[PDB]
Structure 1
């Protein structure tokens, strides 16, 4: 019941992405015409986001406010209005990483300045097009000892 005295922007931990998350949207299925209902697990599924209806559930095992804070034994629907549907978050698990454009194309490349790379051109170079790196150890040569952090191509790799 306390007063909000300080607000704070902080980076998101992948685990935190999951923590605020309810379900994962794993398919491009908006809503199937026949029934203006959410298609499958898709972008509007109600598990992942929330009760498509008032206080009522899915199938209808529990339908009013007396048991407001409990979930259906057979179907998991906790309910307030459909607002719980408009505040919940879902996450998508990308295959191979991609980066925030907010951090890479701001005049000073927050990653370009932090990572000593060509502040604006080396980034754009390997981010959107093609160039690879060696993590801990790789005893054999190219001509010189293993590159601890430098990057090699698919052909010489």
Structure 2
């Protein structure tokens, strides 16, 4: 834990939002409801947000901890601890620039 102070708040610029995001969520599907593996692209996506289970890729080619930065060639999910799936944010590219309701109403 860092020793910090001064929490700063400001408008997020679109480039900063792109900076935080790890991937684009293109389709709204999440999971197959049949096999509970997440969608290859979706609101729950291993290749964007993180591996479901600690240190093992989705398709199951790489599962060992020896690998910590590799990104499985078949499934583009990196092998790390599932806790990261708690901090990684995504982003959506809107076709029409949209207003922020808070700053309007």
TM-score class, shorter: 0.7 to 0.9
CA distance in 1, matches of 2:81, 2:72: 20
Shift of residue 53, structure 1, vs aligned partner: 1.2
Counterpart in the other structure of 2:37: 37
| Structure 1 gaps, min length 5 | 106-157
**Tell me, what secondary structure is at the counterpart of 2:90?**
strand
Shift of residue 57, structure 1, vs aligned partner: 1.7
**Tell me, what secondary structure is at the counterpart of 2:49?**
coil
> Which gives a bigger RCO, structure 1 or 2 (Cα 8 Å, sep 6+)?
2
Shift of residue 73, structure 1, vs aligned partner: 5.7
1:57-92 CA distances to partner (integer Å, 9 max, x unpaired)? 233343233332x21362543333211112111111
TM superposition score normalised by structure 1: 0.59
| Structure 2 gaps, min length 5 | none
1:67-78 → structure 2 map (5 Å cutoff): 67-68=67-68, 70-72=69-71, 74=73, 75-78=75-78
Counterpart in the other structure of 2:24: 24
Misfit runs of 4+, over 6 Å? none
CA RMSD of aligned residues (A): 1.9
Counterpart in the other structure of 1:152: none
1:124-143 → structure 2 map (5 Å cutoff): none
1:98-135 CA distances to partner (integer Å, 9 max, x unpaired)? 11111111xxxxxxxxxxxxxxxxxxxxxxxxxxxxxx
Count of matched residue positions in the alignment of Structure 1 and Structure 2: 104
TM superposition score normalised by structure 2: 0.83
**CA contact 1:29–1:40 (8 Å) conserved in 2:** no
